[PDB]
C-alpha cells in the first residue's frame, strides 16, 4: 500500500499515518470506494465518527473531485462533460459495445491545460460508483495523452491492486510520436496497449498534417516502437484516419507497406487500423487500400465506428 505522493489516495493514506491512525484504516477506505462502491466518507460507517469528519474537513465530503454537469446522451455511446478545478470542462466517452462491453475513453487534457491524476482517474471512478464495471480504459480523448506526465500516475492508479485493480492489458494509450514518453511507457507499463497515430507514411506530408512530426520524425518514432516490440514482444497498433482524397491513395497504402516491412521483423508485430470517415467519397478506396496492405502480409483491420 503506497499510493503515490500526487494522487488523492496517497494524501489520505499518509495523512491518517500522520494522525497516528493504524495502517488498516486506509484499506477500509479503499474497500468502501471500490468494493462497496460508496461515494461519501460519512457512509463509511466502519470508520470512527470524528475520523469520518476529520476526513471530511481535510478532503471534502465525497471521494470525487469531478462533477457531472451534463450527461448528454446514451444508446451505444454515452458522452459526459465534467467540471474540475478552475471551472474547467472535460469530456469523457463511454462506448457501450452492444455485447455489453463498457470501454471508457477518458481525457488527459482540457492553450492546452493538463488535468491532475485525480481529474483523470475520477472520470473512471465516477462510473464505477454508479454500478458500471470498468472493462477497459483508453487515453484517446482530449489531446495527445503523453504530453501529460500525470497519465503515468493514472496508470498506477488503474492497475493498483487496492484500487481499480485493472490489468495493464485493459489499458490503451494512443500517442502522436512523443519518443521520450514512449520509452518511459515501454519499460514501466509494457503490457499497456500502445497505438501510434501515423496517418501518412510520407515524412513531409505528415508534419504538414500534424506539426509534432517536425521534431519527432517518423523514422525515429518507428525506431522507439521497434525497441518496444523487441523488449516486450507485444503488438503496436498503427492508427490511420483516412481523409478523402488526401491520404487514401494506392501507393500511400504501399508506402505504408514498405515503411513497415523495413522495420524490425518487417513490421509484422504491427497492426494497422484503417479508420473510416463520415461527413470525395471513400467507402470504395478503403477496401482497395485494405487489400494492398492485406496482400502484402500486413495485419490490418477496418474500423467503421
Domain boundaries, the chain: 8-59, 65-172, 176-305
Paired with 175 in beta bridges are 196
Instruction: Please say whether the beta carbons of 43 and 135 come within 8 A.
Output: no
Q: What experiment produced this structure?
A: X-ray
20: annotated binding-site residue?
A: no
DSSP annotation string for 89-144 = EEEEEEEE-TTS-EEEEE-SB---PBPPHHHHHHHHHHHHHHT----EEEE-SSS-
Q: Catalytic pick from 91, 102, 205, 255?
A: 91
CA distance 76 to 80: 13
Resolution for this experimental structure (Å): 2.5
User: In whole angstroms, how far apart are CA 130 and each of 34, 90, 138?
Assistant: 11, 19, 19
What crossing angle do the helices spanning 8-16 and 49-59 adopt, rounded to 10°?
Answer: 130
Residues 6+ positions from 36 with CB-CB distance below 8 Å: none
144: annotated binding-site residue?
A: yes
CA distance 149 to 116: 9
174: annotated binding-site residue?
A: yes
* Domain over 65-172 is classified CATH 2.60.40.1730: no
CA distance 5 to 68: 26
Helix (H, G, I), strand (E, B) or coil at 289: helix
CA distance 208 to 202: 10
Residue bearing cell 477496401: 287
Given this chain, do its domains 65-172 and 176-305 carry the same CATH topology? yes
107: annotated binding-site residue?
A: no
DSSP assigned state of 216: S
Query: Which cell goes with 117?
Result: 491524476
Instruction: Please say whether the beta carbons of 140 and 105 come within 8 A.
Output: yes
What is the CATH architecture of 8-59? Orthogonal Bundle (1.10)
User: In whole angstroms, how far apart are CA 214 and each of 203, 260, 299?
Assistant: 9, 20, 28
Residue 255 annotated to the active site: no
CA distance 42 to 56: 8
143: annotated binding-site residue?
A: yes
Q: Which CATH number fits domain 176-305: 3.40.190.90, 3.90.1150.10, 3.20.20.70, 3.40.190.10?
A: 3.20.20.70
CA distance 144 to 2: 28
Residue bearing cell 509494457: 190
Amino acid at each position: 500500500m503506497k499510493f503515490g505522493n500526487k494522487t488523492k489516495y496517497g494524501k489520505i493514506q499518509e495523512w491518517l499515518r500522520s494522525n497516528n491512525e493504524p495502517d488498516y484504516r486506509m484499506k477500509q477506505i479503499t474497500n468502501a470506494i471500490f468494493k462497496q462502491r460508496i461515494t461519501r466518507f460519512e457512509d463509511m460507517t466502519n470508520l470512527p465518527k470524528q475520523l469520518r469528519e476529520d476526513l471530511i474537513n481535510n478532503f471534502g465530503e465525497t471521494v470525487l473531485n469531478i462533477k457531472i454537469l451534463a450527461e448528454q446522451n446514451s444508446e451505444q455511446v454515452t458522452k459526459v462533460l465534467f467540471e474540475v478545478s478552475d471551472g474547467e470542462r472535460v469530456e469523457t466517452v463511454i462506448m457501450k459495445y452492444k455485447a455489453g462491453w463498457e470501454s471508457f475513453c477518458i481525457s488527459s487534457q482540457c492553450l492546452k491545460k493538463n488535468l491532475t491524476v485525480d481529474e483523470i482517474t475520477d472520470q473512471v471512478l465516477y462510473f464505477h460508483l454508479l454500478g458500471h464495471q470498468i472493462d477497459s480504459i483508453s487515453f484517446m480523448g482530449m489531446g495527445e495523452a503523453l504530453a501529460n506526465r500525470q497519465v503515468f500516475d493514472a496508470l498506477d492508479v488503474f492497475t493498483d491492486p487496492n484500487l481499480f485493480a485493472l490489468s495493464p492489458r485493459r489499458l490503451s494509450i494512443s500517442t502522436i510520436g512523443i519518443i521520450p514518453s514512449i520509452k518511459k511507457l515501454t519499460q514501466e507499463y509494457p503490457q499497456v496497449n500502445l497505438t501510434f497515430s501515423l496517418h501518412s507514411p510520407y515524412s513531409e506530408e505528415r508534419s504538414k498534417l500534424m506539426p509534432i512530426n517536425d521534431r519527432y520524425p517518423i523514422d525515429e518514432v518507428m525506431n522507439i516502437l521497434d525497441e518496444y516490440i523487441r523488449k516486450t514482444s507485444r503488438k503496436v497498433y498503427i492508427a490511420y484516419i483516412m481523409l478523402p482524397g488526401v491520404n487514401d491513395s494506392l501507393e500511400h497504402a504501399k508506402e505504408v507497406v514498405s515503411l513497415l516491412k523495413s522495420r524490425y521483423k518487417s513490421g509484422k508485430l504491427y497492426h494497422v487500423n484503417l479508420i473510416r470517415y463520415n461527413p470525395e467519397a471513400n467507402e470504395g478506396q478503403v477496401e482497395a487500400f485494405y487489400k494492398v496492405l492485406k496482400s502484402a502480409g500486413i495485419n490490418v483491420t477496418i474500423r467503421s465506428q
